């Protein structure tokens, strides 16, 4: 039997709200593999739930960070530096678009909403990669989360599709720029885990004839960060039961 041993590795998972978050799933697997994981929550409303997740992970370090606030991000990676010394893995599981933009048509998207959506969902990767760069060790890695709508039109995904398009292009450039220093950057294109019409259609259309699970996304995230994927960087890997290959 092969073992994935991440003892002594340090992990920061940003973007956690519930136990059903894809970010948590990756964290669960990372802790299971022996890593020290820290979580970061958006605002004070979610601290209680964040503490419950830390408990489920058998204990975890917590930070509050809003990705729109450069000051808060500065504080986060200062707290990480003090608490971990270095960093191995960074999970980027953050996305947002104003509700007003996620309804109706993409063409009707309002200026301030469009930018907010691109700021949180795409720029935040650049923001956190810059701050993690001097902390990241050899074999280190950043992984983000995206969706098929970046390449093909999925109605009602609107500006988020565009954000993901910007996210994935970011992944490639960051992979190119952090590669020399032994850091890998990849994206997980998850299937669904406005929504239910997409969820019940993947099940029917996808080759596996079902939806993917939260654990299946976790497993991919674990692998990509693990030394088992040491030759893999700049990739967008799909865990979607084969949906995206269907015409």
């Amino acid at each position: 039997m092969l073992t994935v041993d991440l003892s002594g590795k340090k992990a920061l998972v940003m973007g956690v709200t519930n136990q059903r978050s894809l970010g948590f799933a990756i964290a669960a697997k990372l802790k299971e593999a022996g890593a020290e994981v820290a979580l970061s929550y958006q605002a004070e409303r979610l601290r209680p739930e964040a503490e419950k997740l830390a408990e489920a992970l058998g204990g975890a370090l917590l930070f509050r960070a809003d990705v729109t606030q450069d000051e808060e991000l500065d504080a986060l990676f200062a707290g990480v530096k003090e608490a971990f010394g270095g960093l191995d893995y960074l999970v980027h599981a953050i996305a947002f678009a104003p509700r007003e933009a996620m309804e109706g048509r993409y063409i009707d998207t309002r200026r301030q909403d469009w930018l907010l959506a691109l700021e949180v969902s795409a720029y935040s990767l650049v923001a956190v990669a810059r701050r993690a760069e001097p902390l990241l060790r050899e074999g280190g890695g950043i992984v983000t989360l995206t969706y098929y709508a970046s390449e093909k039109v999925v109605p009602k995904y609107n500006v988020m599709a565009i954000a993901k398009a910007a996210l994935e292009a970011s992944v490639r450039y960051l992979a190119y720029e952090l590669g020399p220093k032994g850091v890998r950057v990849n994206a997980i294109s998850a299937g669904p885990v406005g929504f239910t019409k997409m969820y019940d259609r993947v099940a029917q259309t996808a080759p596996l004839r079902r939806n993917i699970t939260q654990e299946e996304v976790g497993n991919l995230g674990l692998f990509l960060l693990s030394p088992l994927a040491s030759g893999i960087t700049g990739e967008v890997v799909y865990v979607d039961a084969g949906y995206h290959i269907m015409g």
Copy 2:
């Protein structure tokens, strides 16, 4: 002979600042085909440059609009409506990133530089598309410009590559949303208009401005009435190559 007759057609061309731009080349070809063109220019300090461009096209309407200002875009489309009644073609050749963002690494892009680059280079297509929608007639079309760096890493392209990726995805969604009313949306992926391209490209040369112009013309013309949501490459085949030669 087959003829492309675009007389009676009305076109709005945005983002053209010089005659050696790809946006100008498209405008030129539309004018050659018989269409009436209106140029937009960013600010009144650029009016003399805009007037030279109008003259070089053999006559063109001018309108002032900064694409980060919604009010001015409303004004421009009101002026286009009054002057033309409707619209057939919109050429989006606006591309900008702050100088600091383009110098150094992508990972070092500052927050507001990054947002501005995306605002001017990607969101502007959405902003003009929404305002053009009520003016656009059946068989009408929107065309924009993009580059290969959206899909593959081209160093020193930084945030523009990201903006272009956002732009191409915008083209797809706009093609879906504007399609039912007979409006097509497409992107032209132009090669550079440099030393390594000519050596690597299948054609063993760089493309010309006129070659981009011809594709722009084609895509907007009724000859391309089945084509929408596409990114079409005019790069002498360069992007199909897996190696530098």
Copy 3:
């Protein structure tokens, strides 16, 4: 008014068996632009059909050649050389897969059926390109037809999808090899030509034969002189849909 003047240009159109085909549409447009066209036909039992097509084009040269027979392909290109002196355009509209391969699952395709489908549908492009190369003049071009099943799974397309994937990769490599001599190679990815496609596509309709014709004409014309190694979609936007 911009004009596309293709007078004095010589074209070879292969794979056309009926007037409602996409290959015919391109030929019609080439003829309309002023070019001389030569049609190929598979066997002598099909000459009556081939003559009808020539007449529909308002006159065209005919040559017999089966694309699985190298000897006949040599003869056809010798005939084309004799009759035209050189060649400007080659339209590859050949597509075939045995009926047994297209019925049932792709995984059940028989060896000889699978090979035959790829021979007629993909290798034929290589075979006719090699023979056209010495005839092709500067600014000359080759264009072929493909479908979106090459990239995405369209059930019941089976081995044709694979053939098209093989075809499109061939297009890229041929573009690279024939490029230095001023020859461009491109593919047209057509949507179907008439019900559900009409419901999903951005334009809310299917494409027409003429729309494929127009793209074919454009790609071969000097207006597309900077475009090579491409797969261009005429599908009313359909393939962009998730």
Copy 4:
């Protein structure tokens, strides 16, 4: 600590001729994970080479089959059925194009060379997939090997690129057809690695290019391909099918 326990799992590995192949690397990793492997070999003249491979894997079943011969593939899968009862994994590492096709230009490929390259390199996947289907258990998988030349022009790769393009499309369609029975199909797009690579005259200019151009500034190793093969076949990748995954040190993302 997360463990990948593949004991009790049965694997068929096809197209392995040397220990320095990518197919061998996958087989080794499957063996390390606890699976039992059966190696196929083309002809009986190659039995000594096959035995050395079996020993290097720490023991493996051997079966003779030429993938262009439908009768022999029937025989091999009958033999695998008798010896294993069922199957979990199939590794497709078969790749061949005649020497004349790989020398010169793609446009000069002869008819029968072209067809043979496609027969051995692409159709063989369909052939073995059909026969593996009734043997394959839930959670089972097929993995094959491909490369970047399928999507972009890599000179001197010729018909192999076309075959790889035909192979990847096959992977998609096979993933759709074998999916309902819980079988996944995927392809590994490996960067250049220094035996089967020797039959490709455009490999080395690319090998030197990758180390300078790739984001990681090095070539990948055989073990890195092995690890991905193991991952894709393991239950850890149970949501992944119809995919082409790149292990190329990031090379193919570069413009």
